[PDB]
Amino acid sequence: AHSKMVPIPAGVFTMGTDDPQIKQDGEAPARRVTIDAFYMDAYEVSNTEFEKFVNSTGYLTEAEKFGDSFVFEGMLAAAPWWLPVKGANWRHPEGPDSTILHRPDHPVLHVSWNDAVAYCTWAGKRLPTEAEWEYSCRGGLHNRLFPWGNKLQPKGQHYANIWQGEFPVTNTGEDGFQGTAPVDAFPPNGYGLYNIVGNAWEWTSDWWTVHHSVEETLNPKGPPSGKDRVKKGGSYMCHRSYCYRYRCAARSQNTPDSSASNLGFRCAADRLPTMDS
Ligand SMILES: *[C@@H]1O[C@H](CO)[C@@H](O)[C@H](O)[C@H]1NC(C)=O
Ligand SMILES: COC(=O)[C@H](CS)NC(C)=O
Ligand SMILES: [Ca+2]
Ligand SMILES: [Ca+2]
Ligand SMILES: [Cu+]
Numbered sequence: 001a002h003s004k005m006v007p008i009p010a011g012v013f014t015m016g017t018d019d020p021q022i023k024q025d026g027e028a029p030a031r032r033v034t035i036d037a038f039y040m041d042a043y044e045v046s047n048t049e050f051e052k053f054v055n056s057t058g059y060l061t062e063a064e065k066f067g068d069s070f071v072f073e074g075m076l077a078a079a080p081w082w083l084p085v086k087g088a089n090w091r092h093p094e095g096p097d098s099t100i101l102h103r104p105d106h107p108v109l110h111v112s113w114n115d116a117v118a119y120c121t122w123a124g125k126r127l128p129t130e131a132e133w134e135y136s137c138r139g140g141l142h143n144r145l146f147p148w149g150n151k152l153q154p155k156g157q158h159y160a161n162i163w164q165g166e167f168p169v170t171n172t173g174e175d176g177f178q179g180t181a182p183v184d185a186f187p188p189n190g191y192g193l194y195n196i197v198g199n200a201w202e203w204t205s206d207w208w209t210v211h212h213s214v215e216e217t218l219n220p221k222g223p224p225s226g227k228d229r230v231k232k233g234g235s236y237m238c239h240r241s242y243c244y245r246y247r248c249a250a251r252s253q254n255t256p257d258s259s260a261s262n263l264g265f266r267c268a269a270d271r272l273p274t275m276d277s
Contacts, residue, residue, distance in 0.1 A: 026210030124273030
């Protein structure tokens with residue numbers, strides 16, 4: 001049931017942080033946000049779920065139409081380790097000779113913001129807003145680094161799929177996965193969400209800004225205009241040493257037509273969509 005959703009309860013939470021770790025990203029100021037009750041996908045959208053959508057609609061993703069997408073060099077641009085690879089896309093995540101046949105339950109990758117909106121709308125859903133996403137990530141805890149608390153490895157256990165070792169030379173796979181993990185891997189957070197931090201980055205519906213006010217808001221949607229859309233949660237590539245973005249308060253951005261080997265999504269909805277019998 002990798003398309004199942006969980007009810008996210010109505011509430012008020014502190015979005016952002018007054019102790020930002022990447023100040024340039026507008027993690028600050030902390031602000032009180034009220035969110036109405038809604039539903040969030042328990043899992044990142046998987047390759048199998050995305051294939052159902054493509055089978056139904058014939059949808060060609062933007063990476064397939066452009067002919068290329070960004071791949072991390074270690075698995076074969078914003079950084080030397082990001083390469084535009086011809087023929088890399090959701091069915092071929094590291095280029096034309098790679099395949100998804102052995103990883104049907106891993107998160108779909110190389111999906112743009114437009115691809116994600118197409119999928120979620122086809123499913124009777126939508127992308128979450130940044131505030132909905134962050135509220136859900138926090139899993140009912142207040143002002144914590146991670147969905148589960150402040151310790152990276154609570155009780156000596158790995159709680160998310162990120163990088164271990166010296167990036168980018170060595171990824172030890174200590175957490176069990178060098179690349180992606182199945183969408184149902186690792187513990188759920190307090191709302192029942194899996195891999196909300198780590199694994200694949202996750203698109204949200206908001207336009208990106210770094211300028212936020214301390215005023216209290218209700219179901220905020222982000223700025224009315226922009227050039228980049230917000231992504232959240234970090235990925236299997238993140239490490240404290242260079243990309244400390246597997247925190248709920250963290251945030252990044254990309255143009256809506258862009259795609260990469262560490263970027264996926266999950267859907268949300270005001271109410272349960274029609275039962276998929
Ligand atoms: C998509 O269609 C192909 C061809 O009919 C089929 O083999 C495959 O199992 C389908 N995928 C899903 C997820 O239903
Ligand atoms: C995310 O990619 C990796 O961890 C790869 C897998 S072969 N290893 C290196 C050293 O980059
Ligand atoms: Ca890992
Ligand atoms: Ca994720
Ligand atoms: Cu990161």
